[PDB]
Amino acid sequence: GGGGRKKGASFQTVSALYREQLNRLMASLHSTQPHFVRCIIPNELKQPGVIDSGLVMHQLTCNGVLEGIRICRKGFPNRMVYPDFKQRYTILAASAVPKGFVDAKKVTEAVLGAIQLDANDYRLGNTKVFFRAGVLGRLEEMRDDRL
Amino acid sequence: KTDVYKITASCMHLGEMKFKQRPREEQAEADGTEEGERVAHLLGVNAADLYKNLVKPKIKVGNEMVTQGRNATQVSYSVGGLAKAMFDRTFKWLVKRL
Amino acid sequence: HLFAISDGAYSAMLANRENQSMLITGESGAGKTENTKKVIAYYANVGAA
Amino acid sequence: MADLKAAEVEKAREHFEIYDWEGEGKIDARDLGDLLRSLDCKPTLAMVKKNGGSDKRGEKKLTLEEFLPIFSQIKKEKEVGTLEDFMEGLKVYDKAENGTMLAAELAHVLLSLGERLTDIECEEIMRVCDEDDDGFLKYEPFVKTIIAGPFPDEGK
Amino acid sequence: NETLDTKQKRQYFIGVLDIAGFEIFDYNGFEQLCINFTNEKLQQFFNHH
Amino acid sequence: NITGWLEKNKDPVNDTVVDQFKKGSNKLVQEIFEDHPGLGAEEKGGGGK
Known part of the structure; x- marks a missing residue:
């Protein structure tokens, strides 16, 4: 058989039982698209109305909130896909691209150029397009104005 | 008319999908x-x-369900798989619909 | 707003297949769970059938 | 320039006579709409209010001599509604582009958006058209019949 | 969970994390080490994401 | 020749995409996918046969 323990638990104490749990949880938290809300204590006196800014300053630095605002500005948050333009948006701007498909990068600049977006809100790479905030869900909105 | 050809020609297309080695992973x-x-x-x-x-x-x-990114050759192979999936299913659809 | 956090996540999940976990951070003094009772209630208002 | 052929003048009249019940030699700012309709034009209410007709009966009456300029005006217009302008919208209603959209789903939105329809205008159009025993109303033949008109080859 | 799960075995699923904040005390045993350790790791879950 | 046969008698693709292809359009393109007559519906777990 298995040369180990078997009935009851293994020789798994409370720690081991709870450690198995402690792995699954963390993994399954890694398996998802995480969304965050950071919350700030206004003072320690339990006082409504009042707020202390030395406490917010110390909060922002330690929890790295400044750094967060610093990364959203510099990044390109959403590594999504090119064909999502032409397939769906035929409805929006019918004469965006004619008969003449070639460099798909160049085809897509033309369709997105007709809908007037410079290639820095949506960033291009090779395979994929990166979307900054609004940009994909501005495209959705543009169709969904007439829709 | 256009519909049977639509499902036929994609199988000529697909293998155009060029996977390429980006060795960081x-x-x-x-x-x-x-x-x-x-x-x-x-x-x-x-x-x-x-x-x-x-x-x-x-x-x-x-x-349960965990997301994964796939490694280079598995994807190329699965894409070639997507072609062999389309053609097998369609001709079997077709002979009965004939 | 809270509700405006929820809808953004939802339709994204419904388009792109990405399930998600929302996580509240903070120390001991602010107000974490407080929200969650209102999150659940709202989620039942949209989650209703 | 724009102008109206003699045949056009007689058609406008031939209906007008039937519309003016009373005999004032005059129609109403409502009737203006359903006239253009029967006369084989299709303006919107927004188009009628673009040019001086109305919802309610009992304000301003118009003559044929007011009507024929208006009839000459609509003759210049492009933005009536094309097959394309419709094929645009139908393609959010297919949950996966087949042609076969859903009757009750159509009903909720017609009550919600655009100009807005009634209970009656919804049930009548559904009951008028091709309900299969699932309920998959075909968006394109539906539109094409709207483009065709009230009476097909069955005079019914 | 017995009464309020009506659909075992199906996805999708979503989460809302809910735990305390920064709390410290004298008698460390099996207990209090779990709390600050998870607050740390949750900051780290921010950093890595 | 025998080296290979196994994979020609198992046939391995990607689930999520052909399941999302089931949610396809163009009528004929759609029909080609499911149970009810018996063609695809092609993954998840019919019990172990």
Whole structure:
């Protein structure tokens, strides 16, 4: 058989039982698209109305909130896909691209150029397009104005 | 008329999808869109699904679900798999519909 | 707003297949769970059938 | 320039006579709409209010001599509604582009958006058209019949 | 969970994390080490994401 | 030649995409996918046969 323990638990104490749990949880938290809300204590006196800014300053630095605002500005948050333009948006701007498909990068600049977006809100790479905030869900909105 | 040819020609297309080695992990994704779109339209499937979810699918673990990025050759092979999936199913659809 | 956090996540999940976990951070003094009773209630208002 | 052929003048009249019940030699700012309709034009209410007709009966009456300029005006217009302008919108209603959209789903939105329809205008159009025993109303033949008109080859 | 799960075995699923904040005390045993350790790791879950 | 046969008698693709292809359009393109007559519906777990 298995040369180990078997009935009851293994020789798994409370720690081991709870450690198995402690792995699954963390993994399954890694398996998802995480969304965050950071919350700030206004003072320690339990006082409504009042707020202390030395406490917010110390909060922002330690929890790295400044750094967060610093990364959203510099990044390109959403590594999504090119064909999502032409397939769906035929409805929006019918004469965006004619008969003449070639460099798909160049085809897509033309369709997105007709809908007037410079290639820095949506960033291009090779395979994929990166979307900054609004940009994909501005495209959705543009169709969904007439829709 | 156009519909049987639509489901036929994508199988000529598909193998255009060029996966390429980006050695930081080896999770390759394929260098374009044209190759994929001339498939995608003729099916009229969600483009935003295809080019994400082919490389990043909802991996059923037993019965729960964990996302994975796939490594270069598995994806090339699965894409060649997508062609052999389309043709087998269609001719069997066709002989009965004949 | 809270509700404006929820809808953004939801339709994204419904388009792109990405399940998600929302996580509240903070120390001991602010107000974490407080929100969650209102999150659940709202989620039942949209989650209703 | 724009102008109206003699045949056009007689058609406008031939209906007008039937519309003016009373005999004032005059129609109403409502009737203006359903006239253009029967006369084989299709303006919107927004188009009628673009040019001086109305919802309610009992304000301003118009003659044929007011009507024929208006009839000459609409003759210049492009933005009536094309097959394309419709094929645009139908393609959010297919949950996966087949042609076969859903009757009750159509009903909720017609009550919600655009100009807005009634209970009656919804049930009548559904009951008028091709309900299969699932309920998959075909968006394109539907539109094409709207483009065709009230009476097909069955005079019914 | 017995009464309020009506659909075992299906996805999708979503989460809302809910735990305390920064709390410290004298008698460390099996207990209090769990709390600050998770607050730390949750900051780290921010950093890595 | 025998080296290979196994994979020609198992046939391995990607689940998520052909399941999302089931949610396709163009009528004929759609029909080609499911159970009810018996063609695809092609993954998840019919019990172990």
